[PDB]
Amino acid sequence: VYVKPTLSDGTCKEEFTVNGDPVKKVICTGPNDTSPGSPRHTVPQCCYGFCIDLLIKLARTMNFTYEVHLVADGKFGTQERVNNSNKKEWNGMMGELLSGQADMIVAPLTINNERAQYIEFSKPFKYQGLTILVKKEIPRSTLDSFM
Amino acid sequence: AFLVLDRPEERITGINDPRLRNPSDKFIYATVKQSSVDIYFRRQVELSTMYRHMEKHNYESAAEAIQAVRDNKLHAFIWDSAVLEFEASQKCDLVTTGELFFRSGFGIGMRKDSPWKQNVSLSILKSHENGFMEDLDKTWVRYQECDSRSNAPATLTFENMAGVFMLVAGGIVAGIFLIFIEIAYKRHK
Amino acid sequence: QPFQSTLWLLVGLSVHVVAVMLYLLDRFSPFDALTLSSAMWFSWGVLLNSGIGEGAPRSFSARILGMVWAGFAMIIVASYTANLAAFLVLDRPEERITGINDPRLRNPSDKFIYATVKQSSVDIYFRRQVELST
Amino acid sequence: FLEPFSADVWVMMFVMLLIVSAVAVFVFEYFSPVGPSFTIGKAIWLLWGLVFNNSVPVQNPKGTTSKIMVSVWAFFAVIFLASYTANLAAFMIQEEYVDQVSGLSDKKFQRPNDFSPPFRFGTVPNGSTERNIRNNYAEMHAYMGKFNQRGVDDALLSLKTGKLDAFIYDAAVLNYMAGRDEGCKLVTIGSGKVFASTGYGIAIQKDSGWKRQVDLAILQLFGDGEMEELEALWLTGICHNEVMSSQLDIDNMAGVFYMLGAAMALSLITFISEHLFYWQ
Amino acid sequence: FTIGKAIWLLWGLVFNNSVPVQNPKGTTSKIMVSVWAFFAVIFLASYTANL
Numbered sequence: 001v002y003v004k005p006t007l008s009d010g011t012c013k014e015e016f017t018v019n020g021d022p023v024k025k026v027i028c029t030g031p032n033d034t035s036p037g038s039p040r041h042t043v044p045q046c047c048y049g050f051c052i053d054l055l056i057k058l059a060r061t062m063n064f065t066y067e068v069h070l071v072a073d074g075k076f077g078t079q080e081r082v083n084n085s086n087k088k089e090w091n092g093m094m095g096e097l098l099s100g101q102a103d104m105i106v107a108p109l110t111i112n113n114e115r116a117q118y119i120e121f122s123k124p125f126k127y128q129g130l131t132i133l134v135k136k137e138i139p140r141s142t143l144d145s146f147m
Numbered sequence: 148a149f150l151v152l153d154r155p156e157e158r159i160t161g162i163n164d165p166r167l168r169n170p171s172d173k174f175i176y177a178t179v180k181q182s183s184v185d186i187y188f189r190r191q192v193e194l195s196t197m198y199r200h201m202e203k204h205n206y207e208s209a210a211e212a213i214q215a216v217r218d219n220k221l222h223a224f225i226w227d228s229a230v231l232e233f234e235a236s237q238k239c240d241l242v243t244t245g246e247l248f249f250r251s252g253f254g255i256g257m258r259k260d261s262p263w264k265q266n267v268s269l270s271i272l273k274s275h276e277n278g279f280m281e282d283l284d285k286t287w288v289r290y291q292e293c294d295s296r297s298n299a300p301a302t303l304t305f306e307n308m309a310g311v312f313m314l315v316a317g318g319i320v321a322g323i324f325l326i327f328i329e330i331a332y333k334r335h336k
Numbered sequence: 337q338p339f340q341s342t343l344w345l346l347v348g349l350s351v352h353v354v355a356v357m358l359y360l361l362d363r364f365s366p367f368d369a370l371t372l373s374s375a376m377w378f379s380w381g382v383l384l385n386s387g388i389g390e391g392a393p394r395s396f397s398a399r400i401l402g403m404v405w406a407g408f409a410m411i412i413v414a415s416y417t418a419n420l421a422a423f424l425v426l427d428r429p430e431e432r433i434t435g436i437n438d439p440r441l442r443n444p445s446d447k448f449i450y451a452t453v454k455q456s457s458v459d460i461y462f463r464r465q466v467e468l469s470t
Numbered sequence: 471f472l473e474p475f476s477a478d479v480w481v482m483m484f485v486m487l488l489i490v491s492a493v494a495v496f497v498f499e500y501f502s503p504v505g506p507s508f509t510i511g512k513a514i515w516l517l518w519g520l521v522f523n524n525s526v527p528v529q530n531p532k533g534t535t536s537k538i539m540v541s542v543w544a545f546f547a548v549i550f551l552a553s554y555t556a557n558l559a560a561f562m563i564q565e566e567y568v569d570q571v572s573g574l575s576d577k578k579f580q581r582p583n584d585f586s587p588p589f590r591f592g593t594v595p596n597g598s599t600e601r602n603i604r605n606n607y608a609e610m611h612a613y614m615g616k617f618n619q620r621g622v623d624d625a626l627l628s629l630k631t632g633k634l635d636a637f638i639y640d641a642a643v644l645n646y647m648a649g650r651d652e653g654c655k656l657v658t659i660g661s662g663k664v665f666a667s668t669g670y671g672i673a674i675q676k677d678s679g680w681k682r683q684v685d686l687a688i689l690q691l692f693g694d695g696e697m698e699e700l701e702a703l704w705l706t707g708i709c710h711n712e713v714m715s716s717q718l719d720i721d722n723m724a725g726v727f728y729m730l731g732a733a734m735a736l737s738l739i740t741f742i743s744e745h746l747f748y749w750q
Numbered sequence: 751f752t753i754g755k756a757i758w759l760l761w762g763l764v765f766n767n768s769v770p771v772q773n774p775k776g777t778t779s780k781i782m783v784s785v786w787a788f789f790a791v792i793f794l795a796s797y798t799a800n801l
């Protein structure tokens with residue numbers, strides 16, 4: 001899911017793939033660039049990518065429309081204590097499904113036991129797992145001198 | 148022997164490595180706050196030692212953590228393979244190293260009622276057999292245009308080889324005084 | 337071993353091409369001179385690093401070949417030892433290690449044989465183990 | 471042979487020849503007594519010979535300060551050659567290997583008739599792989615009928631005999647066979663290229679209340695890592711963990727022969743060019 | 751060309767030929783020295799390689 005700022009007129013910037021096919025984009029209505037707490041504003045944006053391209057295909061094959069909006073929290077979702085309210089609730093993407101603000105989650109949500117107990121998942125569209133990201137080691141000799 | 152054994156370690160490698168098992172200050176590893184990775188490490192029994200290390204270093208989003216590694220303030224970001232393998236293909240400063248674990252894929256999540264539940268999963272399965280996700284894999288994930296790794300046999304640059312060159316330049320400078328001495332010695336005797 | 341049998345032929349066949357060409361470049365050049373016999377001693381002596389051959393190319397065009405041929409002859413000799421060292425470094429046989437956790441021979445095959453003593457503690461251990469049934 | 475000694479080193483040493491030779495010829499030899507004329511060309515041929523495994527006939531200088539400069543250079547030539555073979559030895563010790571085939575996207579599978587000698591490949595029928603091939607590539611499906619096998623074991627050996635060079639089946643089975651193959655010969659293509667990616671699964675009766683509990687029970691094993699040990703115990707491999715001494719052939723050493731061939735061209739060019747000089 | 755000059759000449763060859771030596775004049779003697787120079791190249795190559 002690539003998020004990019006909308007143009008001045010409010011439309012989606014038109015960019016073409018290398019092969020010449022056009023990039024499909026949808027208008028997101030996520031929060032500001034930094035956070036919506038102090039700058040309480042949800043600027044519209046342009047969204048495109050693998051999940052959105054898959055979402056557009058789902059709509060055509062199931063005959064429905066959509067309103068894509070980013071996550072207010074910016075987090076995928078976990079169960080949290082939060083002693084201030086003394087209640088277990090989900091935060092973010094997982095918390096927007098159950099609260100009714102979202103009918104669907106078209107995003108990289110992994111299928112968890114904790115998540116699958118409350119919400120249901122489709123069959124995976126991307127089989128994956130957990131790895132490590134480390135910096136490439138640029139070769140460079142430690143030979144100080146010929147001696 | 149020096150050049151063959153000039154290797155800068157081997158790599159950080161996967162969770163099985165003991166460096167990640169114990170929390171050390173020089174080695175920093177982290178994930179994104181409030182994700183599936185946090186639940187996995189929290190629910191694990193033998194990884195309670197690693198979770199405490201992560202809890203004091205976790206990042207707000209995967210965009211920052213990848214950028215943090217590029218700034219060398221981080222050395223290991225434990226995240227979904229599909230995202231991390233994209234950075235390795237797009238950025239030649241980050242190499243993906245490690246073996247997969249917690250192999251659970253990405254699904255479209257809906258509520259329990261979900262009148263679209265049956266039809267959504269079938270269209271995901273159908274697109275898998277139609278090659279539709281293979282097309283979307285190519286246009287969004289499989290870009291390459293960057294090598295993965297090598298055996299790191301560093302070539303000898305000028306800075307490594309400047310010792311002899313500065314010696315030869317000394318021989319010319321020291322030869323300036325010797326030509327004066329050689330003429331004088333013949334004149335002297 | 338470091339060179340394929342045909343690579344020896346090309347190395348030994350280029351000595352004659354350079355030697356003949358050194359002869360035809362020294363003479364025919366507008367400019368003692370390099371005779372055909374002495375041009376063969378130059379090309380071989382450079383390759384084999386022997387002092388045989390008191391003659392060297394005299395023309396500008398011939399000496400360029402002698403300078404490259406000298407560089408070619410060093411790379412061939414350098415790449416022999418560098419390949420010999422590679423062969424000598426990693427012609428190391430592998431012996432069984434890491435105990436029974438070794439996966440290379442966790443699956444049985446007839447090339448190697450495991451054995452213990454009949455009716456001992458080792459027999460009870462393997463018989464009473466779940467993963468150690470194969 | 472081009473791998474050690476980045477081109478900044480080689481180019482810089484050439485500069486050192488011309489600086490050293492010009493100083494020796496025009497400063498250390500003219501000014502010194504005892505000075506069979508030692509020219510700039512005779513100096514270049516001498517320093518160059520020293521660097522490249524001193525073997526050419528050379529004409530040494532006569533002054534004591536030119537010999538010192540030359541003997542200083544000979545020390546540089548010793549280190550230069552020493553650190554060339556040493557770094558060359560490191561490259562040959564640390565080397566890897568590459569593959570040949572590309573994958574299923576090649577036209578060999580799609581078009582086996584109007585192409586190279588017939589690529590023979592086939593799959594065990596009455597399964598899910600046959601359905602995907604039948605529905606997606608009808609042309610390939612008919613061509614695969616003659617090569618259909620009766621089991622995994624039959625098809626695995628036919629690759630070794632040269633009967634087949636491509637077998638199409640499940641990834642979780644095929645990659646397990648190549649993981650336990652004796653001798654480490656059957657190697658997949660793409661290092662795990664998987665097409666029409668799907669999964670396994672317990673087929674439960676439709677509209678059963680056990681599916682919800684079975685699904686979570688499966689995801690329990692993922693959560694607590696029971697599937698990591700099950701994969702290690704049951705799906706282990708011998709050659710899944712992983713340098714060899716290969717001779718140098720013309721293919722590996724054609725680079726050095728191209729340079730010798732080009733030197734022949736450069737010498738011939740200077741031959742006609744120097745002819746044009748004196749002729750004019 | 752004596753036996754002493756020959757031993758000094760061949761000893762220099764196997765040991766990174768660097769000493770002033772007196773070469774023979776006969777063609778066959780040159781061929782043998784050039785054959786021995788080949789042995790000296792392999793001998794030193796396989797010494798540093800094994801070292």
Ligand SMILES: CCCCCCCC/C=C\CCCCCCCC(=O)O[C@@H](COC(=O)CCCCCCCCCCCCCCC)COP(=O)([O-])OCC[N+](C)(C)C
Binds near residue numbers: 341348349412791
């Ligand atoms: C780095 C330091 C400096 C380098 C210096 C380099 C100097 C290099 C200079 C000259 C070298 C000339 C050729 C030497 C190698 C030939 C190998 C060969 O042909 O093998 C063949 C077999 O191979 C074998 O059976 C194994 C190797 C046999 C070696 C033969 C030794 C005698 C070669 C001569 C001794 C000296 C004679 C006088 C030389 C003036 C392969 O080719 P083939 O024959 O087509 O194979 C099929 C056989 N058939 C045709 C019968 C069906």
Ligand SMILES: CCCCCCCC/C=C\CCCCCCCC(=O)O[C@@H](COC(=O)CCCCCCCCCCCCCCC)COP(=O)([O-])OCC[N+](C)(C)C
Binds near residue numbers: 373374377784785
């Ligand atoms: C059955 C054999 C068993 C024994 C074989 C033993 C092996 C080979 C042994 C000996 C063979 C020697 C080759 C020449 C033979 C022809 C004779 C001749 O006239 O030569 C001519 C050309 O020859 C040379 O100039 C050769 C000089 C180098 C000799 C080969 C060294 C490489 C050794 C092996 C490296 C490869 C190894 C690769 C793997 C094996 C003489 O030179 P010229 O300039 O014409 O002389 C003019 C006369 N003048 C000086 C008075 C003016």
Ligand SMILES: CC(=O)[C@H]1CC[C@H]2[C@@H]3CC=C4C[C@@H](OS(=O)(=O)O)CC[C@]4(C)[C@H]3CC[C@]12C
Binds near residue numbers: 404
């Ligand atoms: C006698 C000769 O004339 C030879 C002998 C050794 C040769 C050199 C070997 C390695 C290299 C590195 C290579 O760097 S590269 O980045 O372009 O790959 C560029 C070419 C260069 C400088 C050769 C130039 C020609 C030589 C000096």
Ligand SMILES: CC(=O)[C@H]1CC[C@H]2[C@@H]3CC=C4C[C@@H](OS(=O)(=O)O)CC[C@]4(C)[C@H]3CC[C@]12C
Binds near residue numbers: 724732
């Ligand atoms: C003065 C000369 O005659 C030398 C000086 C530098 C030399 C070049 C150095 C590097 C290479 C790369 C190599 O690439 S390869 O993929 O074919 O191996 C092919 C040969 C080539 C072009 C050399 C040709 C000969 C030279 C021009």
